[PDB]
DNA sequence: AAAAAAAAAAAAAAAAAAAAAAAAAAAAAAAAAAAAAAAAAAAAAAAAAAAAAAAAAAAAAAAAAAAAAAAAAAAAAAAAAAAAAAAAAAAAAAAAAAAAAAAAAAAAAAAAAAAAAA
């Protein structure tokens, strides 16, 4: 897409647990796992950085 | 023959070092277990290969979570001042091969001496 190019890390989290992410740029973020539903292997939702 | 410096007399000031003996620790150098790594054998799970198959991307289309707009408000990060940590640049150095000067052994031969022959 014109956001997405590359797929890059997958974890296992349960409903309570965040997820750190980093940028090449000296940027990171601690997000609540909370606020996104689980989708069926298609489809783009939320943008977390 | 003039200048300068060493050394020695005797009461003063002030320092430094080598060993013995026992018992404990701390460096520092070795054999020797012990496991990576590597060479050279047989051996055996994976790709190949082929036929056969059915599970998930397309497609229609609603709708429901969404990313931009608007607003208010909090205050992370960036650049400018100073103040420490830590590493190359350059220069210096102590043993260390090279050279030169003095001590001990060497015999050739003779002065002086000691000793004895007729």
Excluded: K, Y
Excluded at 1 to 9: D, Q, T
């Amino acid at each position: 897409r014109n956001g997405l190019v590359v797929g890059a890390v997958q974890v296992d989290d349960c409903d309570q647990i965040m997820m750190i992410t980093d940028a090449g740029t000296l940027v990171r973020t601690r997000v609540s796992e909370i606020s996104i539903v689980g989708r069926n292997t298609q489809g783009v939702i939320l943008i977390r950085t």
